[PDB]
Amino acid sequence: QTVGVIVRLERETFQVLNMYGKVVTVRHQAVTRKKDNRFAVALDSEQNNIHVKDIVKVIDGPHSGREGEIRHLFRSFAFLHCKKLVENGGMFVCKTRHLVLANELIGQTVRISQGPYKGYIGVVKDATESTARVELHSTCQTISVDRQRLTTVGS
Amino acid sequence: QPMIYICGECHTENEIKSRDPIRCRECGYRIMYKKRTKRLVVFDAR
Amino acid sequence: SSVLHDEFIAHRLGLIPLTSDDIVDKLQYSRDCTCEEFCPECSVEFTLDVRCNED
Amino acid sequence: MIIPVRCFTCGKIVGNKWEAYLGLLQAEYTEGDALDALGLKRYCCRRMLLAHVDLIEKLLNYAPLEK
Amino acid sequence: MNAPPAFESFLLFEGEKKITINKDTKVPNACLFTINKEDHTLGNIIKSQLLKDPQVLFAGYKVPHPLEHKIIIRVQTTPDYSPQEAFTNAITDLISELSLLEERFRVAIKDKQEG
Ligand SMILES: [Zn+2]
Ligand SMILES: [Zn+2]
Ligand SMILES: [Zn+2]
């Protein structure tokens, strides 16, 4: 349930800062690593999208008038970073809401059924929701085709 | 699963299993060729 | 299984002249036809099946 | 390797002439006479027949892979 | 690898217009007609027919680039006339001449075949 960021390093003990913002001491063995959400989504008071590595201001919450850089994000929590803050090694945590702004067709064999390339046959190398890349069996070229002009050839 | 190969000497089809060494069951030749694909091959006649 | 590769054969087939004298005015361009692959309104089918069993 | 279907230059069909041309030569026609007999008037078509090398026979000398 | 498809020389791309008209502002009564997916065939016959018109002061055409499929026709007329009118009348004259030629060729073929 609780995920934190290690803010201080010592010989024996650890001082890991959890989401709630308090400081709890743990050992090396007990604490196990967790991967970082390189991509995620959240919500804010302004109702605007917020991603990591964005400068934000804590206009409300545990801290007031505080500026930091996001390093990790949680469903309802986010970890801010700084260099001017003595307390907690410059890293604190505040709520996300309180923060404010400051493929199935790939590899199949298709027949182009409409348009100037009608009749040609190829293998789909890449398909978005609307358009596909088809390597043509006969021309040494890969072309982009609207997916509405394709029919998969069945065995 | 079958994986049919053609012998280079006697032209005999014969089954081969991955991890099985290459050797014609008839004449013992060690060179074999894969058979043409069953995938659809279509050419413009240009 | 001939000594000529597929594109070679296809190119030669493409170059064979076909009597077109009255049909061609009737046929539609394949790109314009509503058929999905090929229909008698925009194409003519050919088949070839030859095997050499003699010396 | 095999006789081209058309003359490169004008598109006249020459792919149905090679066996006939070989026949006429063995019947003692000169190449010029044989080309005249086959109706090859322009020198482009005549080049097509005169310069052909029927390499496909040599290729047919090798045993096929599949029986 | 960079070869254009062969049909590209005569098939209009989506949204492409067959013919566009602009005014030539250097001189009065002059227009440029840009035609897409046409080449010397149409350009030359249209220009020659326009040169037959006594109210046409200038007529010429060019292909800006052989690897592109556009022709530009420039027409200047006398002030009592319009380049649009000259262009339309030239096409009508060419169609008439072709129709007559087709009729007469049919008649000549029939004569030759009978004897
Ligand atoms: Zn063998
Ligand atoms: Zn059709
Ligand atoms: Zn020729």
Curated annotation (Swiss-Prot), chain A:
Residues 50-83, 104-137 form the KOW domain. Ubiquitously expressed. Methylated by PRMT1/HRMT1L2 and PRMT5/SKB1. Methylation negatively regulates interaction with P-TEFb and RNA polymerase II. Phosphorylated by CDK7 and CDK9. Phosphorylation by P-TEFb (CDK9) at Thr residues of the C-terminal repeats alleviates transcriptional pausing and promotes transcription elongation. Dephosphorylated by the INTAC complex when transcripts are unfavorably configured for transcriptional elongation, leading to premature transcription termination: dephosphorylation is mediated by the PPP2CA component of the INTAC complex. Dephosphorylated by the PNUTS-PP1 complex in termination zones downstream of poly(A) sites, thereby promoting deceleration of RNA polymerase II transcription. Changing residue 34 to A: Reduces the affinity for Pol II elongation complex. Changing residue 38 to E: Reduces the affinity for Pol II elongation complex. It is found in: Nucleus. DNA binds at residue 75. RNA binds at residue 35. Changing residue 38 to A: Reduces the affinity for Pol II elongation complex. Changing residue 33 to E: Reduces the affinity for Pol II elongation complex. The modification N6-acetyllysine is found at residue 118. Component of the DRB sensitivity-inducing factor complex (DSIF complex), which regulates mRNA processing and transcription elongation by RNA polymerase II. DSIF positively regulates mRNA capping by stimulating the mRNA guanylyltransferase activity of RNGTT/CAP1A. DSIF also acts cooperatively with the negative elongation factor complex (NELF complex) to enhance transcriptional pausing at sites proximal to the promoter. Transcriptional pausing may facilitate the assembly of an elongation competent RNA polymerase II complex. Interacts with SUPT4H1 to form DSIF. DSIF interacts with the positive transcription elongation factor b complex (P-TEFb complex), which is composed of CDK9 and cyclin-T (CCNT1 or CCNT2). DSIF interacts with RNA polymerase II (Pol II); forms DNA and RNA clamps that stabilize Pol II elongation complex while maintaining the nontemplate DNA strand in the transcription bubble and nascent RNA in the exit channel. This interaction is reduced by phosphorylation of the C-terminal domain (CTD) of POLR2A by P-TEFb. Belongs to the SPT5 family. This is Transcription elongation factor SPT5.
